[PDB]
Amino acid sequence: AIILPDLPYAYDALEPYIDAETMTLHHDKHHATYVANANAALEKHPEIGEDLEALLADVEKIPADIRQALINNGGGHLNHALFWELLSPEKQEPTAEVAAAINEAFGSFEAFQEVFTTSATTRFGSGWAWLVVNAEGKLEVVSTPNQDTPISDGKKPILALDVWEHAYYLKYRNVRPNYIKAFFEIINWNKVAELYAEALEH
Amino acid sequence: AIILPDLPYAYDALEPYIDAETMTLHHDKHHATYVANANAALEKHPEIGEDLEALLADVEKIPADIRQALINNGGGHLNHALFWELLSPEKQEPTAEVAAAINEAFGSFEAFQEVFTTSATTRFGSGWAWLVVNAEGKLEVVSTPNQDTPISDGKKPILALDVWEHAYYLKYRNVRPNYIKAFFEIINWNKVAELYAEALE
Ligand SMILES: [Fe+3]
Numbered sequence A: 001a002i003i004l005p006d007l008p009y010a011y012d013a014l015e016p017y018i019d020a021e022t023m024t025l026h027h028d029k030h031h032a033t034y035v036a037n038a039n040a041a042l043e044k045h046p047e048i049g050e051d052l053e054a055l056l057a058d059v060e061k062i063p064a065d066i067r068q069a070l071i072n073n074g075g076g077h078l079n080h081a082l083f084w085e086l087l088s089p090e091k092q093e094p095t096a097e098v099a100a101a102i103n104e105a106f107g108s109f110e111a112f113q114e115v116f117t118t119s120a121t122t123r124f125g126s127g128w129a130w131l132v133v134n135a136e137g138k139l140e141v142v143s144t145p146n147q148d149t150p151i152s153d154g155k156k157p158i159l160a161l162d163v164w165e166h167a168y169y170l171k172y173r174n175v176r177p178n179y180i181k182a183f184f185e186i187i188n189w190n191k192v193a194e195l196y197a198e199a200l201e202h
Numbered sequence B: 001a002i003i004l005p006d007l008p009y010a011y012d013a014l015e016p017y018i019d020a021e022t023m024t025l026h027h028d029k030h031h032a033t034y035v036a037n038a039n040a041a042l043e044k045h046p047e048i049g050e051d052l053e054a055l056l057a058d059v060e061k062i063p064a065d066i067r068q069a070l071i072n073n074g075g076g077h078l079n080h081a082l083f084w085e086l087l088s089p090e091k092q093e094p095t096a097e098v099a100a101a102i103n104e105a106f107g108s109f110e111a112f113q114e115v116f117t118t119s120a121t122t123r124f125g126s127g128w129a130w131l132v133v134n135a136e137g138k139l140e141v142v143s144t145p146n147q148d149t150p151i152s153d154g155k156k157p158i159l160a161l162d163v164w165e166h167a168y169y170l171k172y173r174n175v176r177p178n179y180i181k182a183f184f185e186i187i188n189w190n191k192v193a194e195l196y197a198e199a200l201e
């Protein structure tokens, strides 16, 4: 069964940039729901196993009677599990490997930050902004709706920002640009590096 | 230009069911932004006029360059303008013909409320739950994503509930069902009636 992972840090470890109340609800209610619902789907189809990264890579291969349920809830699990690991109680900067990759794709960190900020800001309705490795090993910024993940498009996420209103409304209310700015103070660049390196390996 | 309508009641008129801070943000920030973005789009195309209901009923006739922006922001304005009118600061009950139509269509009001509540809770992500009069003059519950409106599908709304998290999160947090229950205390049934009568015309 899919298990709800604990946060890597205290509920208040990302203050003042994300409030503890939001960390609490976000993890203990939202993410827990996704996990429950993902487990309900998977239990109908024990034959498919519980490797959600692999299952979500080709959604058409998921059995039709649980396909949207698994996309939405298995995707909600994957995305939030990743999100928590990508947040750091301590300030960081991109490691050399990642900074070089960013410059290769976007020219400069400032350009990347503009592009990713824009992606996060213009996502209409619920969704996520991502930095991903494509099948050629090169970086892209993309956003997705609801709990859709770029894994389903053959991409490997290295950075993820939740832009559902639940992720920011208690502190930031309508002002999602302030939330997006705040995120850049709490990125776990070392975790981005790990995911980047893993994406190149095979 | 599209004008932001004032609320029909004070910001705190729906308390304790909807908090004032939400009403204020929702109207003054969210709906205002939809209006501003809708005007920015229409200003590129003055020759199309500003009849958003007509424009959104057949979106394939809004120019392509502003089509999505007008769906999202034109639709955000129409949906929110309707929603403020559908809320009542004192307790109302269904009018007779609307009650009867609901019992014919749904069995009982309690079943209708269940159906509507299911639609509202299962709308995944952002969107709206609706009671509409379809092309046959028949009642249907449906949900839509984002700011999509059933008028784009030839359906006439008589009840609408915003289930974007901005509409409920400050008070209800994750518990969208408690917000939906609260809505049922604050429906303007008189408005529902007007809308229903117009749909059947
Ligand atoms: Fe979330």
Ligand SMILES: [Fe+3]
Pocket (backbone or CB within 6 Å): B026, B030, B080, B162, B164, B166, B167
């Ligand atoms: Fe709204």
